[PDB]
């Protein structure tokens, strides 16, 4: 366009982009700042950084860039490079891994009244204080704090477009749910500098994690092994395989502990409930191994060296087996030949007595296993019901 060529030549012929767009140095530039969230790229819980794809809409008036439409063939709007005009130096205060300011100098829209709209894109990698205490049923609240860097509130003023960031074209995450989003403007006064207020706009988003992936991939196998933990008490000692089962459960839990500790950040501000519950399950398994070692020792107790104490006999044979209703427990040379038969009969009697005492020991071990099985099943079911305030079983 010839008219637009002449107009662009006239607009920038004596225009200094270093100078603020005010008619008097006393006045301030009024900038309307709107944040549009396009996509939540990631939430890095370990590194505590949230990456978002945004557009930073900024509107202000530049009276040096106005013209009469009748003098230019009726042109009312033109597109100008953002590098040609004065721009606000809007900086993300809580930047963690990206750029502080806008780096994609896209074109801007200029009206004949001097009104400018500029909506550059950005990838904001902001710091996010991750609250890993209800993982993976946690909700996150972390923000993006925007402000003019080198100008105070008396030189450049920023105001939000609306109370909330724009999520009209937001792309659904699949890992997080936007519960709430809001934008608050703040006036900050420092004791150094009473006459200069410092403006700031903070946008915050409430993210609710969708827990299905972590549930299926982590929690269910942990629950499976935790439930198999108490099954060692139904395994008879004569099988000689209790240690195999118990230790295998322990090894699986230590592998899953490795997985969990590589899942979450290493901050000690709050103890994750998943880590605490995993430690509790490990204590559970260790106590199970200890008490099943005690049971194995009791089962193989030799009657020759150990005699059953009377209290043990009373407790584990006279009163407890009656309690369990659901169990199926039970509650010349002819002389030499003569003394040979004598000896055989006497040895069989001694063998019978020793076997009876050994069977008493085995019965005591069996009763201990039944008590432990009932207790451990009850504990496991109560525990699995009461985790994450029951949100696991509710899911």
């Amino acid at each position: 366009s010839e008219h637009e060529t002449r107009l662009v030549a006239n607009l920038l012929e004596n225009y200094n982009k270093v100078i603020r767009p005010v008619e008097h140095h006393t006045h301030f530039v009024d900038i309307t700042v709107g944040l549009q969230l396009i996509q939540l790229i990631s939430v890095d819980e370990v590194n505590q950084i949230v990456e978002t794809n945004v557009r930073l809409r900024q509107q202000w008036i530049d009276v040096r860039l106005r013209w009469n439409p009748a003098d230019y063939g009726g042109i009312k709007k033109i597109r100008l490079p953002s590098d040609d005009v004065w721009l606000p130096d809007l900086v993300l205060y809580n930047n963690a891994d990206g750029d502080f300011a806008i780096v994609h100098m896209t074109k801007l829209l200029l009206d004949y009244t001097g009104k400018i709209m500029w909506t550059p894109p950005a990838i904001f990698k902001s710091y996010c204080e991750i609250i890993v205490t209800h993982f993976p049923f946690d909700q996150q609240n972390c923000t993006m704090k925007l402000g003019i860097w080198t100008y105070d509130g008396t030189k450049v003023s920023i105001s939000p477009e609306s109370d909330r960031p724009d999520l009209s074209t937001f792309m659904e995450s699949g890992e997080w749910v936007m519960k709430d989003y809001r934008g608050w403007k703040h006036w900050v006064y420092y004791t150094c500098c009473p006459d200069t207020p410092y403006l700031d706009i903070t946008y915050h988003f409430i993210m609710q994690r969708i827990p299905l992936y972590f549930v299926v991939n982590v929690i269910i196998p942990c629950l499976l092994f935790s439930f198999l933990t108490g099954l060692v008490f139904y395994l008879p000692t004569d099988s000689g395989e209790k240690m195999t089962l118990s230790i295998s459960v322990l090894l699986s839990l230590t592998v899953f502990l490795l997985v969990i500790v590589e899942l979450i950040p290493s901050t000690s501000s709050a103890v994750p409930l998943i880590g605490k519950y995993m430690l509790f399950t490990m204590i559970f398994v260790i106590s199970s191994i200890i008490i099943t070692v005690v049971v194995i020792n009791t089962h193989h107790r030799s009657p020759s060296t150990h005699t059953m104490p009377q209290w043990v006999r009373k407790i584990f044979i006279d009163t407890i087996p009656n309690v369990m209703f659901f169990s199926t427990m039970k509650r010349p040379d002819v002389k030499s030949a003569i003394e040979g038969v004598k000896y055989i009969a006497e040895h069989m009697k001694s063998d019978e007595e020793s076997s009876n005492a050994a069977e008493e020991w085995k019965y005591v071990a069996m009763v201990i296993d039944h008590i432990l099985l009932c207790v451990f099943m009850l504990i496991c079911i109560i525990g699995t019901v009461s985790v994450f305030a029951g949100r696991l079983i509710e899911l």
């Binding site: 659904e172 699949g174 972590f214 395994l235 592998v255 427990m329 039970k330 003569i338 009697k349 085995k362």
Partner: protein, 406 residues
């Protein structure tokens, strides 16, 4: 040449590449947008982005770049650096990184009629929403959305690119056989192109290119599915071992640990979204739960086998079910010295008879265990076969539609 230099000096004496070419105020520039795919590099399911090597075929008309060839020694077209002329800010809108613009700024081709064609190359990384339900027997629908970042429908009019003989529009991604590398993991099923509007925004218009790609699941088959099939076979086998062997827990627990390890290592390659569970993960969980039940029932069988009359009394229902009814169905049917010496012989005979009766009752318990174990074998074989076949038959009947819908 000298004449080309003269033509360039004449053309760009007052040419401003910042100004969209509109011969009269209100005119719109028609921009034809096409895409050529040279290589589909990656489809990263973890971060949900697609990396492609593409040519962006753009064509428009600039009325300011017009000349008469007869006045310039018959020059009919020029190759001009792309930065010297106005171009529309045609960018990939749904990029995953911050890269909106092209990578390679090739020369534009300007004809004497003002027609400007530009084919820059780029390495685009565009966000693709992965549907994880049928992974790894899945097909994906990855789109590339192109539009002018600056100008709206009031300033430019996006259209489809033309073919070599410029008579018909090409409403699809162009693939050149001379320059195209097959991915080896994805096969392209459909590659249509379409223009999209928004009913709530009359100034919006883009050209979207769709890549309907189907995964080739041989890698996942070989490295995950067959080993888990062997593990499930072992989990069925554990019910054929006799309880006296002392290796029932070893086999069942080893199978459980193997399948758990396979699940953990496959959790690396699957996407981390929580909208659905992939068919491979569901199969792994089914196998893991089946092996856990195998462990539980093996413990039960071992407990039954090791009972004795000194400890348990067989209830009526166990004897009725496992001794009499099931085995036919399961085909698993089964001188004072003389006086004292006489007394000693009496004692020995009584001890032998008592031991025989005790052994008979123990044998009854062991037979109950054997019958229950055989029943578990049949039941687990049936469940494993039916579940595995059902899951993989469900996964097999997942093909992209014949109509791309776009």
């Amino acid at each position: 040449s000298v004449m080309e230099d003269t033509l360039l000096s004449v053309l760009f004496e007052t040419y401003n590449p910042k100004v969209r070419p509109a011969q009269t105020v209100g005119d719109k520039v028609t921009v034809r947008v096409g895409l050529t795919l040279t290589n589909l590099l990656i489809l990263n399911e973890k971060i949900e982005e697609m990396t492609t090597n593409v040519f962006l075929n753009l064509a428009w008309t600039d009325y300011r770049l017009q000349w008469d060839p007869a006045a310039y020694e018959g020059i009919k077209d020029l190759r001009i650096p792309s930065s010297d002329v106005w171009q529309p800010d045609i960018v990939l809108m749904n990029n995953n990184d911050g890269s909106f613009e092209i990578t390679l700024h090739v020369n534009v081709l300007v004809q004497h009629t003002g027609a400007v064609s530009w084919q820059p190359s780029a390495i685009y990384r565009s966000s693709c929403t992965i549907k994880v339900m049928y992974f790894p027997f899945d097909w994906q629908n990855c789109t590339m959305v192109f539009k002018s970042y600056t100008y709206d429908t009031s300033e430019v009019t996006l259209q489809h690119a033309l073919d070599a003989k410029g008579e018909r529009e090409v409403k699809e991604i162009v693939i050149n056989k001379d320059a195209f590398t097959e991915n080896g993991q994805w096969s392209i099923e459909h590659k249509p192109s379409r223009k999209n509007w928004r009913s709530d925004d009359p100034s919006y218009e883009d050209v979207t290119f769709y890549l309907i790609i189907q995964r080739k699941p041989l890698f996942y088959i070989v490295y995950t599915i067959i080993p888990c099939i062997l593990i499930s076979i072992l989990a069925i086998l554990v019910f054929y071992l006799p309880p006296d062997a002392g290796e029932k827990m070893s086999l069942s627990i080893s199978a459980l640990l193997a399948v758990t390890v396979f699940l953990l290592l496959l959790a690396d390659k699957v996407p981390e979204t929580s909208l659905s569970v992939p068919i491979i993960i569901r199969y792994l969980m089914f196998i893991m739960i089946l092996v856990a039940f195998s462990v539980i029932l093996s413990v039960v069988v071992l407990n039954l086998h090791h009972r004795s009359p000194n400890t348990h009394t067989m209830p009526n229902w166990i004897r009725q079910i496992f001794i009499e009814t099931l085995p036919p169905f399961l085909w698993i049917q089964r001188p004072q010295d003389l006086k004292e010496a006489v007394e000693a012989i009496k004692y020995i005979a009584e001890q032998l008879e008592s031991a025989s009766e005790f052994d008979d009752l123990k044998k009854d318990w062991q037979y109950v265990a054997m019958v229950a174990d055989r029943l578990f074998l049949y039941v687990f074989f049936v469940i494993c076969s039916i579940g595995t076949f059902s899951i993989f038959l469900d996964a097999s009947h997942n093909v992209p539609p014949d109509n791309p819908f776009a």
